[PDB]
Each structure stands twice: as C-alpha cells, then as structure tokens.
Amino acid sequence: VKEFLAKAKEDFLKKWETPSQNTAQLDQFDRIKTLGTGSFGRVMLVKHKESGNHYAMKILDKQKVVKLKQIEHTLNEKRILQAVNFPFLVKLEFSFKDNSNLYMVMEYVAGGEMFSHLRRIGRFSEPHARFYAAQIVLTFEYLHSLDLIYRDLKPENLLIDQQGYIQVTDFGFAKRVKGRTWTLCGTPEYLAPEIILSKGYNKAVDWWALGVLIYEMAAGYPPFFADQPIQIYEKIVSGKVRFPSHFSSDLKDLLRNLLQVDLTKRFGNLKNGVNDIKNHKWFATTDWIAIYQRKVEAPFIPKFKGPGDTSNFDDYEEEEIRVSINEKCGKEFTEF
C-alpha cells in the first residue's frame, strides 16, 4: 500500500527515463469509425489485423499541434501515458508517427463517456457517485505520488468499461513537476481559482477538480455555470456555492472541504494529505481495497453487444486520414 506505490514508482521511473517509441505502424490497423473528435485530431475505433483486437486510436495532426503551440503538452501526454500503469487509467498499447500525424493506440473502453450517461439519466445517487469518486481518489493518489498533476478531470474524459468501472483518459495536460506550474489550461467549469488568478499552482488543483466532479455527478449540473467562460471564472473565484436540497450533510461537508478557495484549508493539500479525504464520513462505507481490486459490484453496467460495438458513443462526421509525401515538423516531435 504505502509500499505498493514503492514498486509502482519504480516501474514508472524506468519508462519515464527511457520511453518506448514506434511500436506499431498505420497499416497494421483497419480504421472503423470515429469515437470522439477534438482540437487537433480525433479518436477512432480501429482493429488490429494480426490479432483481431479492437483498440482506440488517437490521431494528432502535427501541424495543428504546433499551430496551437501544444508541442510540449503533447510530448508530455505520450511520455507520461506510456509510463503509467493503474487499474483505472487507460492502457496505452502502441504509439508511432508518420509524415503528418502522431498516433496513440490505447485499449478500447466500450461503455462510452460518463458524460453521456450522466446527461441522459440526469444525476447519480450518492452511493453511485461515491463508487466513481472512490476510483478517482485512488488514481490521484497514484498520480501525485509520481509527481504528476492531471489537470483535466471532467465527465467527458472518464470512460466506463465492461465492468462498470472507470478509466481515466486524455493526459493532454498531465505534467510531471516538483514545485509549481503556471499554465492556464483545463476546462472552464473545473478550473481551480488559483489557476484563474495566475498565482502559480500545484497538485491541489486536482482535488478541487474532484469536488466539482462529485458535485456534478450528484446534482446533475456543475456548481459554477453560465453561458460564457468569463462569467464562469467570475463565479469560481467567489467560491459561493449552493447545494441541492437532496445532498446529504456528509456530502455537503466533503464538498465544502474540497471546493475551498484557500489552499491552506483544502482537503488533500493538508498534513494528512489524501487521508483527510479517504477518512471522511461520506466514505465510511467505502472499502478502498475492494475498489482497487475491482471486486465491488458496479452500480451501472453498460449494454454491450460484442467487441467493436460503438452503441455507447454518439456519431461523428467521418474524415479520411491525410498523410503527406513530405515529413512535417520532424525535429519538434523527434522524441515521440
């Protein structure tokens, strides 16, 4: 446990120091459909010819990454994702690049985004939200022990697997840092106030992000919302939050301790660290070892109609991968 992370941090350090490269090639896979589109690329369901396995391929257009000045962030994403190993973190299977793009082939989580189920059902009950929250708690403890800050927690980045457990995806803003960083990045509704105020920040922002997640899951809507981000920012730094009348007092107390503007008082960032969170009353019935071992029975199991089934993902406009005859930005992505 306190020594489980010992071994863990050892495997990470080797892969962090000397990262894997070019472990596959584009012609080994048959592209099937888009699962999710994004800023500089997309994610498609692909099928590995030699094994018959399905995977999720993230495709990043090098030229676009450079234009939006996300070179460092992108290298971070791959370097970290290939080195981490946790039951609730998506597994990176292969990575490679070509003249035009960067590719990351991960395990395929068929259950879809937590976001989709959350918006469809409306909100989750407390024990259901607790189930998911417990998983993030252990993942952040794992990640922070390796000096990594996540910075992008949100239902859109959480996928439900065949067992009903969650897999954290998208390490676009993940970063290994000892001390504090200054990048304004993340998603508006989940940004901690110290990010907005440009004060320089640390791992505490992730615990803030957790308070927002738990709030959204249970309420069905985020604590701070409005039509325009700037309006959202204004709300966050005020810290003034109201709770649905159906929230248990135990939940309200945990959220007041996570959604605390004063880092000096924010749970997770205190002398007891994560334990202030793990020992909270709302988590009294939660058996952490059973969660980690994934033996607890998930409260929600997505419908699965065989592998390669994308029923749990909305549809998107298909595009054809374009590969130039000329190498683009080769020197910038040398380490990828």
Binding site: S39, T187, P188, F225, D227
Partner: peptide, 20 residues
C-alpha cells in the same frame, strides 16, 4: 429551478478544453 437554468444554458453538451 437551478436545473431549469442549467438546461437552458449553452454549456450542456461536451465541453472543450482551453489552452491559452
């Protein structure tokens, strides 16, 4: 209700990250 106001807002769909 708060829910009513949220559902009427323009940020009910998938939320994109910011880079700044």
């Amino acid at each position: 209700t708060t829910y009513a106001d949220f559902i009427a807002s323009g940020r009910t769909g998938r939320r994109a990250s910011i880079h700044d």
